[PDB]
RNA sequence: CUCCUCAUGGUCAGACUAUGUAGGGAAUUUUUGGAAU
């Protein structure tokens, strides 16, 4: 079985974006690491609010609980 | 380690707790439970016009943040649990020293 | 919390409603049983006599000492 | 052994941002659930992202009967719950 | 303004003196004293060896703290003597600030001579091990006759009550002494240092006692190494084992070193085993080795302790790698890597580039700019590129050049006697030809973070990777440019056998030259 | 287990009222109460926050969704006074 | 009369397109094929699409890991 | 972990009300320790008038954490 | 301080109760938030 954890491991070292449940924020950046409870670490991160670029944040930590989904970009 | 222990250290301290609902609390911590349930005395409380209350017990999950006095010694309070863990963990040639 | 036993206490709920009753018992989850408990909403206005009630610990915000035990 | 593995996973995981914050004494900015932000230095952290923050500057946005205005205040000694954390950003 | 606080105290006429200082700064202080600029000088205990002639001396406190003891302990009367030699007049003046309990001890043994005694009774295990290894003492009779030469012997006769020998007489001495040496021998045979068999009596030496006695490591340290070290052990475990030793009794701690060790542990690559004690000097040794591998900015207090540790470790780490060889585990590779790390000061995986003297982050990046991986590519580089990479002072450039020169590109070749005829359980001699780039003028090893001087050496290694079995090893000092060395090594069991030879330097990292070959044994 | 869980198990067979996180009130006879506060209820009269009232035969609501219960006063005697 | 994890497993084998109702959000629902799942009901979903109901439009998202906490109601289309 | 006693509700048509003021009707099929439910002949009752047959025989799964309450249509 | 787990000593026919250098109180029914506007 291909589990979310292996898919995410293969997703490490790749450009990703993460849509939070609020949808008030999306984060596009390289996926540095993810822990067993699925917190997210991104680098060179960019914030897209309402689909528009808000700004370039950089090395960023995303609380697991806020993540709606992650997709590869 | 566990920051809740750091809160346990905070008895008899005057603090202002902001809460998730936005409520502001001002009072002297009598104790905090490990749940981070905080019991305080001589509390002025402002819901989002202050109410003065002898004792207030707050459920830990409702606590947004607690603002501590600037006089507090964080260097001293933070390092405890590691020392406690070390204490829990704890031939001829003995005297390198002589006469 | 054990000192508060049998006292008349005021509990503030998650929704902002105010319940007042005698605290007979608690538990780990902070589920409280309140004897002769009444509800106040706005502050007396909109006061209702509920009677014996359990309250969930997930809903409870805070409790304060209202009056002495019966 | 179990303790070792937990500390290590913490070190190489996403947690490395707040670990790096404590060791370098660098400022980080935390977007919270109250729609308030906390830029401060990380004195202590926890698995729950409970934090002791020093030199806190919190910034927020308020609306009035005219143009939106930003408001901010300084809190030198601040302790923070772990659930209010939406995001912890580390930057230059 | 080196010694970051030495400025403000010295500016008002009180100087600071302690070991580990910037030497220039220390010298300035001393000069002020001699010229009279500073009338007062505060010297820490360990600097009694630096003898600054004084008109008067004050000794403040007779009690110094060591963590290992877990309480303050008063100074040696020896230290106080070295502390009173400094002052002479118009009249020699010595103030000694002491307790009431220590008053009668210092007031007597300073004015009246020091009664001298002998502590051999503690080290007898190690000493007798050494004698047996040198094979001067063939039997127990031989050892007793050897104990006839001891200052201990004379002492036990004049003052038998001090050593616990109740009978005072020629027969009593003889009996007590033979008891002591007998106990010693039981510890050694139980610990596999020697073996004793009846035919006067015959005593023989094993591989453990050989190395232990040769390097001079104490009996107890060796026994600890034996108990902990097994197969499939990791590098962390090896490092712990290294940290637990009796040689580190002489590394001092007052309360701050230990608390600061706790604070430092956040920043370190490894984590001390949970079932031993933090206050023990072993934990401190562990963290200071961590701070040696990662170059932290250490307090000048800890620099001295690091230096002491380094003065001890090289024999100890040699013993660690060799004892694993004696137990025939192929994991001695990791011990070798650790020894390299101790000689140099860098990790194996972290970066090979940092090994070259005086490299830091920025300079390493230029190496990534020219896309260099190993050190051998630096040897092929020419002067203009080197000048571009390093802009620095001349002494440092010179040391780097010497590093590059004496670090050989040496090639590993073997010649086997018979590849066709391979018999199981026979002593099979191989002749390995080794050849060096440049023939050395001298073998000096160059490292900044390891102040003491080292001569380079090499280990030749043969073993099979999957079984984690090391078949053969030998140490060589290569003075010539090209040599041949013969490993007499027993062959494995029948069938196909992978045999991988390493040439691993004791000093320099990323020198590992390997050749893999497989033979079919019958 | 919880002492209020123990009381709530005593409340089985009585007529109780339930307020859920939505605010709807269900009054009826409590069939069954699990340890997780999941409750099975009979012959329920329901009052919505809008004020509309309905009748239903068998209802079962999750523990987590219950704001609070009101149980009859008979139980107040004992043995929770200790 | 089958456990829900087994139901999700037959979605997995059949590779049917799946519509997930999220939590406290009626406006948008997510759709796509279940290529795998874990014990926390986090789902890797391929050729996923966001479907705002408010004729329906949607955003093609490609491969997605959706967290199980959002899951309200898993379905097939 | 406790298992809800839903066996009395098995193979019965029930109306689940769910978070977000959502309401679905279907025959109870499976459940688990998690209160997660499998419903067959699932019919969504939208806010307006109509109802859609989402899962006739293909059934559906509802997260027990999203289940507000469950009404038994039968006896 | 509280609940659970574990250990334990006791009592009763798994439960209860004292103590503990113990483990714990972030993945669906409670305390590491679906809230925010």
From Swiss-Prot, chain A:
Sm domain sequence ranges: 3-73
Annotated compartments: Nucleus; Cytoplasm
Gene Ontology molecular-function annotations: poly(U) RNA binding; RNA binding; splicing factor binding
Broad class of the protein's primary localization: nucleus
Disulfide bond annotation, renumbered to this chain: none
A GO CC term attached to the entry: nucleus
Origin: domain of life: Eukaryota
Keywords assigned by UniProt, alphabetized: Cytoplasm, mRNA processing, mRNA splicing, Nucleus, Ribonucleoprotein, RNA-binding, Spliceosome
BP GO terms, sorted: 7-methylguanosine cap hypermethylation; mRNA 5'-splice site recognition; mRNA splicing, via spliceosome; spliceosomal complex assembly; spliceosomal snRNP assembly; U2-type prespliceosome assembly
Function: Plays a role in pre-mRNA splicing as a core component of the spliceosomal U1, U2, U4 and U5 small nuclear ribonucleoproteins (snRNPs), the building blocks of the spliceosome.
Family, per entry: Belongs to the snRNP Sm proteins family. SmF/LSm6 subfamily.
Subunit composition and interactions: Component of the Sm core complex, present in spliceosomal snRNP U1, U2, U4/U6 and U5. The core complex contains SMB1, SMD1, SMD2, SMD3, SME1, SMX3 and SMX2 (Sm proteins B, D1, D2, D3, E, F and G, respectively), and is probably a heptameric ring structure. SMX3 specifically interacts with SME1.
Miscellaneous note of the record: Present with 2570 molecules/cell in log phase SD medium.
Name of the protein in question: Small nuclear ribonucleoprotein F
Source organism (scientific name): Saccharomyces cerevisiae (strain ATCC 204508 / S288c) (Baker's yeast)
Source lineage: Eukaryota, Fungi, Dikarya, Ascomycota, Saccharomycotina
Span covered, complete protein: 12 to 84 of 86
Swiss-Prot record, chain B:
Keywords, alphabetical: Cytoplasm, mRNA processing, mRNA splicing, Nucleus, Ribonucleoprotein, RNA-binding
Principal localisation: nucleus
Protein name per the record: Small nuclear ribonucleoprotein Sm D1
Gene: SMD1
Domain Sm span(s) in chain numbering: 2-72
Extra information: Present with 2400 molecules/cell in log phase SD medium.
InterPro entries: LSm4/Sm_D1/D3, LSM_dom_sf, Sm, Sm_dom_euk/arc
Comment block on domains: C-terminal extension may function as a nuclear localization signal (NLS).
Subunit structure: Component of the Sm core complex, present in spliceosomal snRNP U1, U2, U4/U6 and U5. The core complex contains SMB1, SMD1, SMD2, SMD3, SME1, SMX3 and SMX2 (Sm proteins B, D1, D2, D3, E, F and G, respectively), and is probably a heptameric ring structure.
Places the protein is found: Nucleus; Cytoplasm
GO biological process: 7-methylguanosine cap hypermethylation; mRNA 5'-splice site recognition; mRNA splicing, via spliceosome; spliceosomal complex assembly; spliceosomal snRNP assembly; U2-type prespliceosome assembly
Role, per record: lays a role in pre-mRNA splicing as a core component of the spliceosomal U1, U2, U4 and U5 small nuclear ribonucleoproteins (snRNPs), the building blocks of the spliceosome. Also binds telomerase RNA and is required for its accumulation.
Curated annotation (Swiss-Prot), chain D:
GO biological process terms, semicolon-separated: 7-methylguanosine cap hypermethylation; mRNA 5'-splice site recognition; mRNA splicing, via spliceosome; spliceosomal complex assembly; spliceosomal snRNP assembly; U2-type prespliceosome assembly
Alphabetic keyword roster: Cytoplasm, mRNA processing, mRNA splicing, Nucleus, Ribonucleoprotein, RNA-binding
Top-level taxonomic group: Eukaryota
Limits of the Sm domain: 15-92
One Gene Ontology term, aspect cellular component: catalytic step 2 spliceosome
MF GO annotations: RNA binding
Subcellular location: Nucleus; Cytoplasm, Cytosol
Comment field (misc): Present with 799 molecules/cell in log phase SD medium.
Protein purpose: Plays a role in pre-mRNA splicing as a core component of the spliceosomal U1, U2, U4 and U5 small nuclear ribonucleoproteins (snRNPs), the building blocks of the spliceosome.
Membership in a protein family: Belongs to the snRNP core protein family.
Subunit note: Component of the Sm core complex, present in spliceosomal snRNP U1, U2, U4/U6 and U5. The core complex contains SMB1, SMD1, SMD2, SMD3, SME1, SMX3 and SMX2 (Sm proteins B, D1, D2, D3, E, F and G, respectively), and is probably a heptameric ring structure.
Protein's name in the database: Small nuclear ribonucleoprotein Sm D2
Provenance organism: Saccharomyces cerevisiae (strain ATCC 204508 / S288c) (Baker's yeast)
Gene that specifies this protein: SMD2
Included stretch of the parent chain: 17 to 108 of 110
Swiss-Prot record, chain G:
InterPro entries to which the protein is assigned, alphabetical: LSM_dom_sf, Sm, Sm_dom_euk/arc, snRNP-E
GO CC terms in record: commitment complex; cytoplasm; nucleus; pICln-Sm protein complex; precatalytic spliceosome; spliceosomal complex; U1 snRNP; U2 snRNP
Subcellular location: Cytoplasm; Nucleus
Keywords for this protein: Cytoplasm, mRNA processing, mRNA splicing, Nucleus, Ribonucleoprotein, RNA-binding, Spliceosome
Keyword Protease tagged: no
MF GO annotations: RNA binding; splicing factor binding
Top-level lineage group: Eukaryota
Chain ranges of the Sm domain: 5-77
Pfam short name (any one): LSM
GO terms under biological process: 7-methylguanosine cap hypermethylation; mRNA 5'-splice site recognition; mRNA splicing, via spliceosome; spliceosomal complex assembly; spliceosomal snRNP assembly; U2-type prespliceosome assembly
CDD domains: Sm_E
Function noted in UniProt: Involved in pre-mRNA splicing. Binds and is required for the stability of snRNA U1, U2, U4 and U5 which contain a highly conserved structural motif called the Sm binding site. Involved in cap modification.
Family: Belongs to the snRNP Sm proteins family.
Miscellaneous comment text of the record: Present with 556 molecules/cell in log phase SD medium.
Protein's recorded name: Small nuclear ribonucleoprotein E
Species whose genome carries this gene: Saccharomyces cerevisiae (strain ATCC 204508 / S288c) (Baker's yeast)
């Amino acid at each position: 079985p291909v589990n979310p954890k292996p898919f995410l491991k293969g997703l490490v070292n790749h450009r990703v974006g993460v849509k939070l449940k609020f949808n008030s924020t999306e984060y596009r950046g390289t996926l540095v690491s993810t822990d067993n409870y699925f917190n997210l670490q991104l680098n060179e991160a960019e914030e897209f609010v309402a689909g528009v670029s808000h700004g370039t944040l950089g090395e960023i930590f995303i609380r697991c609980n806020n993540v709606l989904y992650i997709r590869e970009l | 380690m566990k920051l809740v222990n750091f809160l346990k250290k905070l008895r008899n301290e005057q603090v202002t707790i902001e809460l998730k609902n936005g409520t502001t609390v001002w009072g002297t911590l009598q104790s905090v439970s490990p749940q981070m349930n905080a019991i305080l005395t001589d509390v002025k409380l402002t819901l989002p016009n202050i109410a003065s209350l002898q004792y207030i017990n707050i459920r830990g999950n409702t606590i947004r943040q607690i603002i501590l006095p600037d006089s507090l010694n964080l260097d001293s309070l933070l390092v405890d649990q590691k020392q406690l863990n070390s204490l829990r963990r704890s031939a001829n040639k003995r005297p390198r020293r002589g006469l | 919390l054990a000192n508060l036993i049998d006292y008349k206490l005021r509990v503030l709920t998650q929704d902002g409603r105010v319940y007042i009753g005698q605290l007979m018992a608690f538990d780990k989850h902070m589920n409280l049983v309140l004897n002769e408990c009444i509800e106040e909403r706005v502050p007396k206005v909109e006061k209702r006599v509920l009677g014996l009630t359990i309250l969930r610990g997930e809903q409870i915000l805070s409790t304060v000492v209202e009056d002495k035990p019966l | 052994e179990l303790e070792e593995l937990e500390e290590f996973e913490f070190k190489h995981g996403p947690m490395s941002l707040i670990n790096d914050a404590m060791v370098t004494r660098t400022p980080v900015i935390i977007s919270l659930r109250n729609n308030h932000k906390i830029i401060a230095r990380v004195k202590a952290f926890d698995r729950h992202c409970n934090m002791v923050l020093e030199n806190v500057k919190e910034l927020w946005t308020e609306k009035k009967g005219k143009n939106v205005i930003n408001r901010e205040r300084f809190i030198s000694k601040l302790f923070l719950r772990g659930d209010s954390v939406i995001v912890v950003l580390k930057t230059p | 303004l080196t010694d970051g606080h030495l400025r403000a105290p010295l500016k008002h006429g009180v100087g600071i003196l302690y070991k580990g200082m910037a030497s220039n700064d220390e010298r300035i202080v001393k000069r002020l004293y001699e010229y009279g600029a500073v009338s007062v000088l505060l010297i820490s205990k360990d600097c009694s060896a630096f003898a600054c002639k004084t008109d008067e001396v004050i000794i403040l406190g007779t009690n110094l703290y060591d963590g290992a003891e877990h309480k303050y302990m008063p100074y040696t009367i020896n230290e106080l003597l070295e502390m009173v030699g400094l002052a002479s007049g118009m009249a020699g003046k010595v103030l000694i600030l002491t307790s009431h309990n220590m008053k009668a001890y210092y007031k007597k043994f300073l004015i009246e001579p020091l009664p001298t005694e002998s502590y051999l009774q503690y080290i007898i295990h190690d000493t007798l091990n050494n004698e047996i290894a040198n094979s001067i003492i063939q039997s127990k009779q031989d050892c007793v006759d050897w104990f006839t030469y001891s200052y201990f012997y004379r002492r036990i006769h004049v003052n038998p009550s001090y050593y616990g020998v109740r009978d005072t007489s020629p027969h009593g001495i003889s009996v007590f002494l033979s008891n002591l040496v007998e106990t010693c021998l039981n510890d050694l045979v139980e610990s596999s240092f020697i073996e004793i068999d009846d035919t006067t009596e015959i005593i023989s030496t094993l591989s453990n006692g050989l190395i232990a006695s040769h390097y001079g490591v104490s009996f107890f340290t060796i026994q600890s190494f034996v108990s902990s070290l097994s197969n499939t052990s990791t590098l962390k475990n090896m490092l712990y084992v290294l940290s637990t030793a009796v040689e580190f009794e002489s590394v001092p701690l007052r309360k701050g070193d230990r608390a600061l060790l706790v604070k430092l542990s956040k920043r370190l690559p490894l984590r001390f085993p949970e079932h031993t004690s933090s206050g023990s000097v072993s934990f401190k040794v562990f963290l200071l080795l961590q701070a040696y591998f990662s170059r932290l900015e250490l307090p000048v207090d800890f620099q001295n302790d690091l230096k002491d540790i380094l003065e001890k470790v090289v024999p100890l780490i040699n013993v660690v790698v060799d004892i694993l060889s004696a137990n025939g585990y192929l994991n001695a590779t990791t011990a070798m890597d650790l020894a390299q790390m101790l000689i140099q000061g860098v990790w194996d995986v972290d970066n090979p580039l940092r090994q070259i003297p005086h490299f830091n982050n920025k300079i390493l990046e230029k190496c990534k700019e020219i896309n260099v991986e190993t050190v051998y590519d630096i040897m092929a580089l020419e002067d203009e590129e080197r000048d571009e990479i390093l802009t620095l002072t001349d002494s440092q450039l010179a040391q780097v050049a010497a590093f590059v020169n004496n670090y050989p590109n040496v090639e590993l070749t073997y010649s086997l006697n018979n590849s066709d005829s391979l018999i199981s359980g026979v002593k099979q001699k191989i002749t390995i030809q080794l050849t060096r780039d440049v023939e050395p003028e001298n073998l000096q090893v160059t490292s900044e973070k390891y102040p003491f001087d080292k001569l380079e050496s090499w280990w030749l290694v043969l073993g099979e990777v999957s079984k984690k079995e090391l078949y053969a090893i030998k140490k060589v000092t290569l003075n010539k440019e090209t040599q041949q060395y013969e490993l007499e090594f027993d062959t494995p069991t029948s069938g196909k056998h992978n045999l991988t030879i390493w040439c691993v330097c004791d000093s320099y990292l990323d020198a590992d030259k390997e050749l893999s070959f497989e033979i079919n044994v019958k | 287990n919880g002492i209020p869980v123990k009381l709530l198990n005593e409340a089985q067979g009585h007529i109780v009222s339930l307020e859920l996180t939505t605010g709807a009130t269900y009054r009826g006879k409590l069939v069954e109460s699990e340890d997780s506060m999941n409750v099975q209820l009979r012959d329920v009269i329901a009052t919505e926050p809008q004020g509309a009232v309905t009748h239903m035969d068998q209802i079962f609501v999750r523990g987590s969704q219950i704001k609070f219960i009101v149980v009859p006063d008979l139980l107040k005697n004992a043995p929770l006074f200790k | 009369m089958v456990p829900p994890i087994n139901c999700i497993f037959n979605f997995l084998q059949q590779q049917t397109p799946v519509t997930i109702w999220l939590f406290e959000q009626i406006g948008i629902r997510i759709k796509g094929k279940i290529v795998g799942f874990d014990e926390f009901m986090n789902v890797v979903i391929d050729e996923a699409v966001e479907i705002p109901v408010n004729v329906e439009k949607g955003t093609p998202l490609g491969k997605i890991l959706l967290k199980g906490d959002n899951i309200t109601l898993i379905t097939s289309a | 972990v406790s298992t809800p006693e839903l066996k009395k509700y098995m193979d019965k048509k029930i109306l689940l009300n769910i978070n977000g003021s959502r309401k679905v009707a279907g025959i109870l099929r499976g459940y688990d320790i998690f209160l997660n439910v499998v419903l067959d002949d699932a019919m969504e009752i939208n806010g307006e008038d109509p109802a859609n047959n989402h899962q006739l025989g293909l059934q559906t799964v509802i997260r027990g954490n999203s289940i507000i309450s469950l009404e038994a249509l039968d006896a």
